[PDB]
Design a protein around this ligand. Structure first.
Ligand SMILES: [Mg+2]
Ligand SMILES: [Mg+2]
Ligand SMILES: [Mg+2]
Ligand SMILES: [Zn+2]
Ligand SMILES: [Zn+2]
Ligand SMILES: [Zn+2]
Lengths: 412, 412, 412
């Protein structure tokens, strides 16, 4: 035992102690048996924010022309440097453009930008924001991301997915770059700090299945036919609730298959806005430990997927104590697509194929074509076996590496 | 000190506590002094299992020709997808061939495959399994790995070491690939999911010395002449037992040398089958903490070398709580060799040079020539100083990077 | 709660416990809430020491000729192998030369060497040591590092920054390697194990600001104008001391900016030699936990910058329990400079630009030109805003990636 430790207050020398909960200011442990971390040491929020090189700076707007809408310096609400740029428009799209002092070669370069939504209203309270490159021939190439409420309420980087290209665009001879939106009754959004990242590696695909439906069994068989790895974005309360969701044994048996892995999606799927940050934190913590009891270990259980795609900087700050990376939701090919090097592991989206495989298969083919990473997702109740087989065969026939979320985060 | 925590049961507010053992469900620690992990958060077993791309699928056997032996679909027992290939043969080898719809280029690629042993019997209950590529000239190039009892009793991936090449083989212009065994009185094995991985980097060499014999001093001096890293696969009980084993001070002094590092080999060298999984787990745990007391810290002490080379999925499952990677034993060049990218950190072997340096020097030259990683090993009682000098000069003269196990795992 | 644990001595079954300090031999924790590590599991001291390939081993001095000074095989005192080279000179420099058996190509290679100071005296206690390549035209190219008291008192690898080049030096056709010093009344230094590492990737810049002076606000704006990331080498006691040092809220606000990160510099700036190792360890530990309370999380708070640049192997040994990487100080361009691949994360220096920007802007231009990493530093009280703008524009105009210390360590 020894004698009692040094000091005042209740001090005790024990042999063996059992407790439900231990709070300690400091703990000196000679040998630690604690593989099941809830609270992770890594804060991922700002690690990736300053990768690559700043291509466009916004610190002086003399080089930018407002083509449509309006542009002004914002020196109070600054992402980086001395100022950011306010983009503002009424009943109109905004389009601003910058002309290079010499021809730019952007072969193997992906694009990223800082964004904050102040106001957007019209056909949606959101807009696609599009980085358009333009060549010496006036062909465009478009990369895009979504400015939304919640996830855009505070400054956050988007890593832009390929969207479209005018046939024969000369990426070696880019003469201007342009930033533009859909038209709305009101637009007020801030931007800053455009970054260029090396994306010269192969294209890559990530597949996630949400919400632990019984069809995940047939999904695992289908995507298994080409060794494509599936992430089960798992809610542990949903297991054994009904015939429509996996049993505990089915989930464990699925995760034993070498291509299936689990990521956290909250114990009871508590989404942002629908619940308080505290209740979501409990859902996150409980999701983590329940999945760890089901054998989901560290590199896997460091990933989270936003319940119902809802998020904000509030939820990101909370989640950063427990997870390193998270994914939202979108309907279109550019939502799935990111450069291979991220600059935010929190803000990026996934393309749904619950509504039809077109946008996902467009993303997979574009991932191959333009050397990008595509994240595609579904619920296995919504999607038929034939739809899964279309996507699986698209991925097998494309020039992409199918990868886990763990692999993708390890590449950063 | 404060007042007692919220709750029923025995609750206590302490200042300073000492314990031999603490069991907690929840531990909230504001500052952690616990560098010596026993139980690691990372589960390496299935992380690497979906690296690279599935080259050959076994999901439809219409494309496979049974040259010798016999081939059938297994659908009750499947690594990946809807099916796996059963290979069955009597008083013969099995050899199955797939002819490509167009010429294949495998320059800088390495190969991997999923395997399970159902039965093998004859002169040995084990076989080399060989992936043979064949060119437009009918030159072969062969890579291989071993199907063994224990390590093949459940599905596991092998990552295939180069073995042989017919002079002038055109790796750019492969027309067919072949899976084949040695001849045996009975063969019954399942295969699935052949994977191609990028191995276009330089060749690499890893040297391990097992069981802490006193000759490790001369070994350290010899391999030190060319700064080649030595892994001591260490049993901490063996230190100070006899004049034939290192003293504690000698072992610490060896590890202070910049090229020497320690990996776990069980406190008392308990091996699979010879002892229960529980006893081996205790030996693994004690090995880890005794070596940590001797100063062997995290990236080093995350590696384990199987005692007497014995293992199975039972032991891998247990070891995955404590270690990230383990290595078995073999006698030939294709044992030492792997692609630079593994798909299993658990199933791969090492070539002995206890009996003679030939197959190890072959492995080093193959690693240089064909861009692969070679792991070579010995006991320093079995090997004379001039034999070590032959191997050390072989490594120094070859085009390979000599690396640590830590470096190799960080590259995955 | 359950019944009391197995054992003699004081045993207890608790529900909820609170403690200031817990000492445990074994802790079995089912769910760990301990993001704030003080003791890190990783021991970085010898991980990188045996990267790359040994070029000159000094294990046979038949190939070496003294141009000036004297040389012997040191067999009593050896970094690597059977021997080291003892370099000794009186009232003179030393310069020793090895002729290559053929034209070496060192395009994209960087250089590293083991060093120990026995004695250096005269005009200084210390010397630049230069690795000095000679081409087929008798042009030199020079890389260098500093031999000093303290940091050189025990064997430690230096990774050599570019220093100078005779115009038109053919790096593809190198004919002789030379090792040389400044002239001194006494020189007695041991060298061993010259290593070659691949540094063919892009050049890189790391910017650190020391000692939390209020000018860090203007620095954040200036380097922010180009998205270059700043490391605050932070002392947590200094916050709120004076108008001349940041407030706690200013420091937190600074670290919320995506390009500003914090690294430890000791709670109260206790430097080696000035205080005992125990006092410095307390300063290191308190620095770590106070900065963790300010929100500085794991990958950031795993870096430490030496207070007043003072260090030895004693401090490195102690620091290795808490940090992975540390940086000293120097006045000149080669002090900033390293290959992209280190071999010691502990012995490398930073170039001051407190005394004018010239040597740092030389280092930035050389980082671009020769594909190297440059670490530059200042105190924001010493440096005017125009000097910061000169450095910031130098970095933005150069061909370098500006990076965090975290990014740099993740690349190793
Ligand atoms: Mg700005
Ligand atoms: Mg299969
Ligand atoms: Mg030596
Ligand atoms: Zn969901
Ligand atoms: Zn052994
Ligand atoms: Zn300082």
């Amino acid at each position: 035992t020894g004698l009692n430790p040094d000091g005042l207050g209740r001090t005790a020398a024990f042999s063996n102690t059992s407790a439900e909960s231990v709070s300690a200011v400091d703990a000196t442990i000679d040998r630690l048996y604690a593989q099941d971390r809830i609270e992770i040491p890594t804060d991922s929020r700002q690690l990736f924010s300053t990768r690559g090189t700043v291509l466009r700076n916004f610190e002086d707007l003399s080089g930018w022309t407002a083509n449509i809408g309006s542009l002004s310096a914002e020196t109070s609400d600054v992402y980086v440097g001395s100022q950011s740029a306010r983009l503002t428009a009424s009943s109109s799209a905004v389009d601003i453009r910058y002309s290079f002092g010499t021809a730019q070669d952007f072969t193997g370069k992906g694009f990223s930008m800082a964004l904050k939504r102040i106001d957007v209203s019209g056909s949606s309270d959101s807009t696609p924001i599009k980085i358009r490159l333009v060549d010496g021939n006036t062909n465009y190439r478009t990369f895009s991301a979504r400015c939304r409420p919640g996830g855009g309420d505070e400054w956050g980087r988007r890593d832009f997915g390929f969207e479209s290209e005018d046939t024969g665009f000369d990426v070696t001879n880019v003469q201007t770059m342009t930033v533009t939106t859909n038209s709305r009754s009101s637009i007020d959004i801030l931007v800053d700090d455009i970054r260029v990242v090396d994306s010269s590696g192969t294209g890559q695909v990530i597949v996630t299945i949400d919400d632990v439906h019984t069809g995940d069994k047939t999904a695992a068989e289908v995507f298994g036919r080409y060794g494509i790895p599936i992430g089960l974005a798992a809610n542990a309360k949903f297991l054994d609730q009904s015939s429509s969701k996996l049993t505990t044994q089915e989930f464990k048996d699925l995760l034993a298959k070498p291509h299936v892995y689990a990521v956290n999606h909250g114990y009871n799927h508590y989404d942002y806005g629908s619940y308080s940050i505290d209740e979501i934190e409990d859902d996150v913590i409980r999701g983590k430990y329940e999945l760890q009891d089901l054998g989901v270990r560290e590199p896997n259980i460091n990933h989270y997927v936003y319940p119902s795609g809802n998020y904000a900087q509030e939820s990101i700050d909370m989640l950063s104590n427990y997870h390193v990376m998270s994914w939202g939701t979108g309907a279109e090919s550019f939502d799935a697509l990111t450069p291979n090097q991220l600059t935010s592991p929190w803000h990026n989206l996934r393309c749904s194929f619950d509504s039809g495989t077109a946008e996902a298969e467009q993303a997979v083919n574009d991932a191959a074509t333009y050397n990008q990473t595509a994240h595609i997702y579904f619920h296995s109740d919504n999607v038929t076996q034939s739809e899964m087989e279309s996507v699986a065969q698209t991925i097998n026939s494309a020039d992409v590496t199918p990868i886990t979320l763990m692999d993708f985060y390890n590449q950063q």
